[PDB]
Write a protein that binds this DNA or RNA. Structure first.
Ligand SMILES: Nc1ncnc2c1ncn2[C@@H]1O[C@H](COP(=O)(O)OP(=O)(O)O)[C@@H](O)[C@H]1O
Ligand SMILES: [Mg+2]
Lengths: 87, 604, 98, 107, 93, 95, 88, 107, 93
DNA sequence: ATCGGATGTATATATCTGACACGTGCCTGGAGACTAGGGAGTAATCCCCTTGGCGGTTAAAACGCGGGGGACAGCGCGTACGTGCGTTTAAGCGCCAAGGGGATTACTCCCTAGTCTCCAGGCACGTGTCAGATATATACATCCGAT
DNA sequence: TCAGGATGTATATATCTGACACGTGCCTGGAGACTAGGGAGTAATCCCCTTGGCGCTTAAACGCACGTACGCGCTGTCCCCCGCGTTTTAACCGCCAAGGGGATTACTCCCTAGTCTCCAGGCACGTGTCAGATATATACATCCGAT
């Protein structure tokens, strides 16, 4: 009856409505619509897919099983958005 | 009511006077006292001469202790208040072993050293502690202060007993959201309107800055194995606390290691066990000779000075002993194919996965037949332990012994709930999900005087300690644990004081698998504990399976009985990846992706 | 009647309070769960460091903040004050991601 | 004789032997001249000094005596020059410089 | 376990522009990354310049061209001025 | 004669079908020399260099006008304006 | 009285109004305002300034005085707008 | 013995000797393997074949028997994968892909 | 003179795929530039990839990783398959 | 709705000029030793990451409500765009003159890099500390929403 | 408009910690020979670019005038989103267990690259054709706009 999960609402829903609003305020918007909270999840998921794909490619090439901060940094730099700090 | 003559001589309670001692005015008054260290070392060598091993090494280190050593070298009634009756200043009675514990506490007090109280559960440890603090109050004339760090669950119990058998003492517990906590701080703590503070492991980390600013006479600690790690945040924080001495009320120390015991000792008397390698190499693991049991084993003489435990086996008697019935179970076909699948493949920690397969393959997603999902005998049909469990549950039910299952995975508890409902028994589940009130009501439901609760699931390491299920008769440790005393406390949830009838505790084991390795290592650690501390106080035709497993248990007991200290610390760490021969070993694209059409001018 | 701010003022205060800080605005554990779920992308069971996830969250939040700035500009351009998915789509199309 | 460092001879602060080694080992080309490391070290030294001066000014303006990533971001983004150089670069824990569109402000 | 870095050198530069301010470790890592990035950009552009013109070597002329080609205008002016004065001092001494 | 917009759609069809250069040749070439006089005196060019420059300029302006049109449509209009093109360039990381 | 060069026209105005309209149509627009012309002239002038500066830097590095198509292609590729067809 | 080229004994059409020469004398690494030229030649051949097939399809669609830069443009922009790969290039003399916004059409 | 082209190899591939069409000179030049651009992209990615791992050798493993880093999706899949096919044929023969 | 009308749209013809085929030689890729060093494999050490589970604090997050202000439709309306027509004007193409700029093409040497051999002096790492940046509290002064 | 609240904004203070200074080991940057080949200088040779012009064709660009339809401002009217209070729940620490993964630090060795020497075919260059694709008219059909 209950050995089946029936739990764990989608992880994209973990990007809550108020977090989207905080990002929006730091961006500088005053008034928000109601479908922004779905368009934003879509765009974030796409961006993460691309970056993680490249990072995992680097990791597999090095014959590792651990994605390292330098792998992520190389992936972002290849995508064209350098990240100072980490590594 | 009539013990008030002892209260004579105490100064009247007044925060202004208390502030002289409570607040330690000296901002950096912390210093190494040569006098206290000399007295400690002198008494310690008086008991026995073996302790120079630490001292000489420390003299090889910082030489301003080497000169203390030289001073101790060149220069070379304290009557215990036996309290043949119950001490007057505590309203009530104390049993003779309790009295002996109290006298041990006092004798360690008037020797400038401490001692871990590690009595067996139920032997009124807090009674010993309150009695000793009252000794300091009425006789030694130190009202306070005293810190009583404890687990959050028992805070109310500590306070209830402290106000019951010694009402004169004023004490309070910190709690509540930070605002009323701070109110209590500013009103009483820094106000100095108490004698005994009670906190929790979490609050000590939380409210540490005010608690720094009191010269602490002692720092009591309830079950102390929490502090068995000396890199734990609690251990780090509970070292800047300026204090005279310390106490470490606990249950059983040395649960899975020896270095653990070293750190537990290091807490009380840092100036002796200041070096890790000293303890780690003097009579810890080495590879020298027959010394393992010729000398270093005999060298308990370092401990008996400061440690105590009173075996509840014979100091009480009523709990008929125990009944351990390990059952070696063979894997079934689904287990065979799955276990091989893990061996040669989200699946990390292959050792954890192998434990899952040894419990029920339905834990793996997509294992059971379906959808649609049913609950018929196709559930029991694929898990060997569950088959034996079904047979044994039926046998117990016809006998009529309501049972506690102490699983180790709550998901396994989900499958067990489904199986139980399908078999029309009813239960009450407690795990890391049920809130407090749920836990209390479930315990009450099980412990109703006429309760229709056959099975009663839990998780082995959960529920704290106040859970009391002596009404139960059988405990089925569906899984074995790494730490033997984890399962020991679990299986004493039923063997706790007050249990009337002899109980049986089963331990399903998956033969020819990881579970055998886990059981072997757990027995290593249990026998280590015994040596170090406990001395110096289709159907399987269940009957033949029982006999075979009993013979196996006798054989392994014989195997591990005759091991030695350095040998028993080996931790063979035999790789479980290889089970029946393993080698550490685990297109054409004809798609022609797409071809659009209509490349002509026909958009318009 | 209890004191109540008129619509817009709390929003302006929030803008000027979040444009001054520097911490992360998405929760660490939800973001990590999302990352590891996506990580079944071109591989199967994988291990992540912690610096990896922190770098990934830094990059994501910077990207989203820039996107929201461009969206705000589009919404104001339409003689409006609210941002809408049409604004998200326009901004993200012009930048060249769609 | 007595060793006299190439950084000392050129009068710079950044290392020139290390820069020479990096040019040789990065297989940027087969041969590297003797003045290329000096020129490169001087340029790197100049840019570092420029950004550090701006960051220190920002730190003083914030009533602090230690540079932090926020101060680095403020120094970079305020001038139209290092902003153009570091255009695609995101600085960890940088935040964003404050502005609010004038349309959103009240009457 | 030895890891080369620019922390010592950027700290020497800092202690002569603002002789009393310090710098946190995270800012230090950011500065080291910035120096590495700019070094890679200039070196790569100089390498491509040498490859374009059939030359087999990198020299101060290529470095100057790469600087004047990457840095924006008014910044590049001062950069090349200071590079030239440093190299002339090295040559004279 | 013809209703407004008819010739406009006709011209869009005409010009999205072809591939030639849209800016005159000599005016652009003259502009390139004049704008190149500032950086360094007395430069010489060659026809292929100027043709590459023109081709790049054509492509850039065409993409810019596509973005501007899409911006104008976003604001419930069909007429493009300087506000539209400024918004497009600023979003596209240039202003 | 006309010995001087009083007669002359600015070169940015050589980008005629209908040429900008042809570009606009190929982009796919239907109505053009009156100020799009001036704004377009401005943006084109800026773009040309950047590309030509980089190309001239390449040529003067190579110790030449002619800007070759390969130099312009290198300049564009550096700007980030690589161009296929003129060699390279 | 008689010599047979690596292109032939690999089965490809693109040159492997020239690719190996470029990889060596291109300052990409100190040492170049033995299968790298073969792999690179294969990849280049595949991409060339793919784009040329699409271009020929378009040219036949327009009743012509010679691929021109217009057909190259049209094929590249109509195939989305090649469009992403070549998202930043500009094929000279390629024109633009026909497209009119729906709102602009007459009622 | 003596400028290498790729024109003849592209023309061979064309006469394999569409054995009735042709290429004008401008299209041919565009195709040659395309091949050179892709070559330099892949080679540069492989060079950086070997530098990241402290290797001094470019081999087919780095070439493959750079291919699947640069080409998107189905293009990458087919190109990888074809490259592995060619390499195995070469080694066997 | 129909008729007129302007506008692509297929269609046969002549032009030519740009793609494709063919011979040369020369230089680069292939065959064949020879060799050294790079990279694969193995063993020991130590720190981080995994999986499943537990217990606690406490701010954020979810939800409901109410009310107002902003978005979205309609309604004029009065420009500023379009479309069409007539007329200059300039682009484009030819043509003239004389040079320098530049890219091979072929030696010729110098000088300035790489390579090797020590060897000390930079620099990185492992230890203290203490000064700056926190968090706390309080008083203040400073906008905002209802007369 | 003015008095009434809510909210940063300073000021003063106790605390934590992570920059900063200091001492050693070592490894690599510098001194000093030696060498060889890259590049700088010279000097032929041919092709393109420049700066002043001139004459001619012929489409585009420009200017002007109706005159719509659209961009803009007003008004109305919902209704959707913000502000705020109230529960509750999920993040966030802290823990526990074992083992594997990844980095270093040696060692060892083999094989596969680079380096040569020859030597022939593959590829580039210069030629010579011919057919694919224009441009030109021509009849066809096919939206668009006014009665
Ligand atoms: N008269 C008595 N003498 C001795 N012990 C008693 C007496 N009355 C009660 N006790 C027990 O003393 C115990 C002290 O608490 P204890 O069980 O030791 O908790 P913990 O094990 O957590 O310290 C109580 O549980 C209580 O049952
Ligand atoms: Mg207790």
């Amino acid at each position: 009856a209950k050995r089946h999960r029936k739990v764990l609402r989608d992880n994209i829903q973990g990007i809550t409505k108020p977090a989207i609003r905080r990002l929006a305020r730091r961006g500088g918007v005053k008034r928000i619509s109601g479908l922004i909270y779905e368009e934003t999840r879509g765009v974030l998921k796409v961006f993460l897919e691309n970056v993680i794909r490249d990072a995992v490619t680097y990791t597999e090439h090095a014959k590792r099983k651990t994605v390292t901060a330098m792998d992520v940094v190389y992936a972002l730099k290849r995508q064209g958005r350098t990240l100072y700090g980490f590594g | 009511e009539n013990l008030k003559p002892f209260q004579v001589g105490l100064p009247p309670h007044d925060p202004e006077s208390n502030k002289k001692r409570y607040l330690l005015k000296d901002a950096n008054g912390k210093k190494f006292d040569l006098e206290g260290t000399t007295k400690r070392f002198e008494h310690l060598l008086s008991l026995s001469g073996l302790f120079k091993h630490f001292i000489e090494s420390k003299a090889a280190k910082d030489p301003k202790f080497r000169q203390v050593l030289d001073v101790l070298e060149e220069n070379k009634e304290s009557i215990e208040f036996q309290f043949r009756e119950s001490p007057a200043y505590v309203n009530g009675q104390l049993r003779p072993y309790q009295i002996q514990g109290v006298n041990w506490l006092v004798s360690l007090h008037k020797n400038k050293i401490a001692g871990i109280l590690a009595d067996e559960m139920g032997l009124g440890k807090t009674l010993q502690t309150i009695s000793f603090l009252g000794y300091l109050r009425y006789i030694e004339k130190i009202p306070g202060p005293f810190l009583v760090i404890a687990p959050k669950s028992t805070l109310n119990n500590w306070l209830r007993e402290i106000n019951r058998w010694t009402p004169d003492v004023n004490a309070f517990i910190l709690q509540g959201d930070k605002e009323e906590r701070a109110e209590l701080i500013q009103k009483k703590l820094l106000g100095c309107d108490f004698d005994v503070v009670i906190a929790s492991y979490e609050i000590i980390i939380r409210e540490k800055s005010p608690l720094k600013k009191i010269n602490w006479e002692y720092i009591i600690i309830d079950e102390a194995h929490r502090i068995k790690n000396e890199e734990s945040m609690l251990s780090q924080v509970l070292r800047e606390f300026t204090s005279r001495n310390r106490l470490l009320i606990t249950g059983t120390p040395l649960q899975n290691n020896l270095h653990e015991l070293w750190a537990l000792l290091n807490f009380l008397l840092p100036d002796i066990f200041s070096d890790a390698q000293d303890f780690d190499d003097w009579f810890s693991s080495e590879s020298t000779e027959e010394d393992q049991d010729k000398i270093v084993k005999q060298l308990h003489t370092v401990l008996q000075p400061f440690l105590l435990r009173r075996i509840k086996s014979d100091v009480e008697t009523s709990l008929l002993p125990k009944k351990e019935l390990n059952l070696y179970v063979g894997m079934s076909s689904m287990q065979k194919k799955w276990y091989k699948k893990i061996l040669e493949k989200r699946l990390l920690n292959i050792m954890m996965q192998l434990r899952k397969c040894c419990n029920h393959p339905y834990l793996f997603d997509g294992a059971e037949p379906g959808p649609p999902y049913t609950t018929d005998e196709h559930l029991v049909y694929n898990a060997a332990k569950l088959q034996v469990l079904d047979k044994l549950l039926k046998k117990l039910k016809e006998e009529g012994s309501r049972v506690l299952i102490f699983s180790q995975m709550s998901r396994l508890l989900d499958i067990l709930e489904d199986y139980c409902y399908f078999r029309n028994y009813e239960y009450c589940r407690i795990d890391g999900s049920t809130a407090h009130e749920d836990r209390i009501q479930a315990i009450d439901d099980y412990n109703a005087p006429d309760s229709k609760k056959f099975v009663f699931l839990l998780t082995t390491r959960a529920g704290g300690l106040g859970i009391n299920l002596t009404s139960a008769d059988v405990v089925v440790l569906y899984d074995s644990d790494w730490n033997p005393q984890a399962d020991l406390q679990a299986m004493d949830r039923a063997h706790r004081i007050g249990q009337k009838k002899q109980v049986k505790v089963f331990r399903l084991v998956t033969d020819n698998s990881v579970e055998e390795k886990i059981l072997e290592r757990a027995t290593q650690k249990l026998r280590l504990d015994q040596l170090v501390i406990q001395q110096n106080r289709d159907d399987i035709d269940l009957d033949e399976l029982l006999l075979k497993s009993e013979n196996k248990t006798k054989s392994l007991n014989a195997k591990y009985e005759t091991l030695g200290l350095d040998d028993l610390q080996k931790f063979n760490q035999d790789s479980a990846y290889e089970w029946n021969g393993q080698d550490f070993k685990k297109l054409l694209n004809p798609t022609k992706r797409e071809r659009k059409e209509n490349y002509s001018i026909d958009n318009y | 009647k209890p004191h109540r701010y008129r619509p817009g003022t709390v929003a302006l205060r929030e803008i000027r309070r979040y444009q001054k800080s520097t911490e992360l605005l998405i929760r660490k554990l939800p973001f990590q769960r999302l990352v590891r779920e996506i990580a079944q992308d071109f591989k199967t069971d994988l291990r992540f460091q912690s610096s990896a996830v922190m770098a990934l969250q830094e990059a994501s939040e910077a990207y989203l903040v820039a996107l929201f700035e461009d969206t705000n500009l589009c919404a104001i351009h339409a003689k409006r004050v609210t941002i809408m998915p049409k604004d998200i789509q326009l901004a993200r199309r012009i930048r060249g991601e769609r | 004789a007595k060793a006299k460092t190439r950084s000392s001879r050129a009068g710079l602060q950044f290392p020139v032997g290390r820069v020479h080694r990096l040019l040789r080992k990065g297989n940027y080309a087969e041969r590297v001249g003797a003045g290329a490391p000096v020129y490169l070290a001087a340029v790197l030294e100049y840019l570092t000094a420029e950004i550090l001066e701006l960051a220190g000014n920002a730190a003083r303006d914030n009533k602090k005596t230690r540079i932090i990533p926020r101060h680095l971001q403020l120094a970079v983004r305020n001038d139209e020059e290092l902003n153009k150089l570091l255009g695609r670069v995101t600085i960890a824990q940088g935040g964003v410089l404050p502005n609010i569109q004038s349309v959103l402000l009240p009457k | 376990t030895r890891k080369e870095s620019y922390a010592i050198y950027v700290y020497k530069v800092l202690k002569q522009v603002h002789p009393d301010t310090g710098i946190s470790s995270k800012a230090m890592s950011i500065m080291n990354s910035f120096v590495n990035d700019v070094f890679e950009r200039i070196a790569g552009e100089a390498s491509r310049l040498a490859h374009y013109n059939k030359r087999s070597t990198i020299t101060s002329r290529e470095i100057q061209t790469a600087v004047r080609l990457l840095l924006p205008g008014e910044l590049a002016k001062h950069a090349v001025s200071e590079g030239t004065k440093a190299v002339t001092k090295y040559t004279s001494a």
